[PDB]
Amino acid sequence: MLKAGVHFGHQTRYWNPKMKPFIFGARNKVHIINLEKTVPMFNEALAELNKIASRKGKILFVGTKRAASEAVKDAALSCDQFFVNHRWLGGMLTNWKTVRQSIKRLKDLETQSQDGTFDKLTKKEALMRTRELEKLENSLGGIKDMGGLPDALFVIDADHEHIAIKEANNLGIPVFAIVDTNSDPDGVDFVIPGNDDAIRAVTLYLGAVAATVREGRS
Amino acid sequence: SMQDPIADMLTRIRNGQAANKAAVTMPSSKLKVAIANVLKEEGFIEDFKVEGDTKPELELTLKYFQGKAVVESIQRVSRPGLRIYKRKDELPKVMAGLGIAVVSTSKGVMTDRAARQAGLGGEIICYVA
Amino acid sequence: SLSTEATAKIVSEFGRDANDTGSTEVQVALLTAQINHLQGHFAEHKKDHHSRRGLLRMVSQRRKLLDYLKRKDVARYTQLIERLGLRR
RNA sequence: AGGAGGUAAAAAUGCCAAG
RNA sequence: CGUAAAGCGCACGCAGGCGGUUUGUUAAGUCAGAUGUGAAAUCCCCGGGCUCAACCUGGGAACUGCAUCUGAUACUGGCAAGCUUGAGUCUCGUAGAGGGGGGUAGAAUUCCAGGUGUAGCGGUGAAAUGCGUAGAGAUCUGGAGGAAUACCGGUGGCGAAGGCGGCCCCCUGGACGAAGACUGACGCUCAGGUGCGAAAGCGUGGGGAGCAAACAGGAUUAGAUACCCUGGUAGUCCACGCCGUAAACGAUGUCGACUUGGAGGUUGUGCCCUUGAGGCGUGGCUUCCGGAGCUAACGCGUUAAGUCGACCGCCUGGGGAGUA
């Protein structure tokens, strides 16, 4: 049942037929989700998220969508977790040993152009050191305090971040994805039927999981 | 033109388990309701029932253990183009005896293991290992 | 063809009553009336190959019903074929 | 979005090469 | 067996194979048991003997079979009675280049005649052959002919396939739908058989505008028996026979069942507020994309090349050869 507003269903008539278990077809040719079928779904996910947090896990907050990037940043930063919000680099989990080389360049440049040599050289390449830093701080921004692999992933759209999902189950990492009526639920280990592209919907989703992980340090 | 209703029954179970349908309905028959009882007592299906009086409807609720079917294979051995009868001593063991073969003996349909200890053979219907 | 009152004449002659319209004696007689009617059509045109395929379908369907009727009830079969003049 | 054209829209010839 | 070799061009069908559902009966198939037999030797098993082994030998099993007897009756068959879903009939409508016959319409090409009118026309990459002062081409009027049906026109429709486009009538086939009634398994497939079967071709008799094999002339070219140009007979058209082939192709046999979806086209129909082009359903046919699955891959994908069943056709390295 609605503890909130807009999380009821979306995205059109056209739909993934693997999510027929969580649907009502509304009169505006827009499928709406069985909310009493997904309310026990994500509190089951909140049961497992608080357990992974209680064994001091590292939880990734992946989802870009150009309209929830600003909110998923504040989700993992209100707690002590990690996130991506700009373009998820294809390979940053399965090929993590060469993305480890790229955060070290970011962690170098956050000392080079910040406090070390920033004006001690030519002015053009000094801007290039900041130009390289500004495209590394959005791609590998929330990952520089990692240094292992994450213990879980929290995706906000499954069909838009299938690359992250395919990389997660290619390892042993479980996922908690907010799947929508057009997205695929088979790659997901903890299917959460809900709206994906609504800013009030996601702040309920990221707000609940950031609240759930910040009882995990007890 | 529907010349084997028994192979149509196993095909509906096979396609129903592949499509992850929870239940399979088919036109009932006295032989279909017999070999459905063999699958229910052996653990391949659950809770078969017959609804109807003049055009009865056999309905079987399929079985799943984890995200996978229970009947991995369900073949039909004595099709109407080629009937297969076996004696008592050459009744087949299917998948080394951990999958059954439905044989129609003169004491009704039973598994191959049941027909050996009963001591008689008959027309073998299906390998539902 | 075989207009609606002409079929009404046949269905009352051969069946039990007027709504009895699907029995073998009715259908065999009803096809034979159409087959005999189309003889004048093909004594004429003779190159209507597309319409003759419908005629051979009516001939072969009549023979299948008579071969059904001779197996079930040979009394009604011999009464039927003398009633229309069949069995060459 | 499909349709039609546009000094314009082509069409002259142009073979062979071996273990 | 889509493309590697391989689905008859397509139907209709006899023999044949197969057959929905319920009860009874029969006990042929089937199953169980027994009896007789299945020669001995070999083969196999457990033994015995040659100093071991080969070899020899005792006993047993086996000889998968056949026949009779006595049982079993689930399945298959037989017989009897049914049942309604398969198949079929009737009533009522709908759509359609389905077929056969007979009429008729307008546009254009060519020819014929005439008026006007003046040196070109036609053609090409460019030319020439050709046509034109005997007056063409252009234009206008009148006529005679034959053939094809612009626009509609649409991965639109219909047909078993080949195929089928102006309009109108006559004769006629099939499909589909709604709501009922009726028959009661009448079904599916089909070797041989029979029928249909583009175009080219053949026979006889017509017809002949336009195109056009052959052929001729002009070009092009090293040559040009070609492409290109100017002509042009058979043929293309009609009637009636014949041929019986095609990349006759979705290179995919027919029939039935089952198995996520999306966007369309087309043609029915139900219900509701038709209130208005809507809304909700439900059938038939059809195009495209795509999931599982399948596939060597390409791809196919509820119209399967998926999962199955019934029957048929066919394939077995390339060439020789679909030839003698």
SSE blueprint:
The structure is cut from a larger assembly and holds chains A (218 residues), B (129 residues) and C (88 residues).
Chain A: E1 24-25, E2 31-32, H1 35-54, E3 59-62, H2 69-78, E4 82-84, H3 96-112, H4 123-136, E5 152-155, H5 162-169, E6 175-179, E7 190-193, H6 199-213
Chain B: H1 5-18, E1 23-27, H2 32-42, E2 45-51, E3 57-62, E4 75-76, E5 101-105, E6 108-111, H3 112-118, E7 123-127
Antiparallel strand pairs in B: 1-3, 2-3, 4-7, 5-6, 5-7
Chain C: H1 4-14, H2 24-37, H3 39-43, H4 49-72, H5 74-84
Helix pairs in contact in C: 1-2, 2-4, 4-5
Chain B binds two RNA strands through residues 1-8, 10-12, 14-16, 18-21, 24, 26-31, 34, 54-55, 76, 78-81, 83, 85-88, 103-110, 119-123, 125.
Family (chain C): Belongs to the universal ribosomal protein uS15 family.
GO molecular function (chain C): rRNA binding; small ribosomal subunit rRNA binding; structural constituent of ribosome
Pfam family, one (chain C): Ribosomal_S15
| Strand portion of chain A | 5-15%
Overall shape of chain B: it is: globular
Order of helices and strands of chain B: HEHEEEEEHE
- Count of structural domains of chain B: 2
Please state roughly what percent of the residues of chain B sit in beta strands, choosing from under 5%, 5-15%, 15-25%, 25-35%, 35-45% or over 45%. Answer: 25-35%
Please give the alpha-carbon distance between the first and last residues of chain B: 28 Å
Helicity range of chain B: 10-25%
Q: How would you write the strand order of the largest sheet of chain B?
A: 4-7-5-6
| CATH fold title of the largest domain in chain B | Ribosomal Protein S8, Chain: A, domain 1
End-to-end distance of chain A:
30 Å
Rg result of chain A: 19 Å
- Our count of helices of chain B gives 3
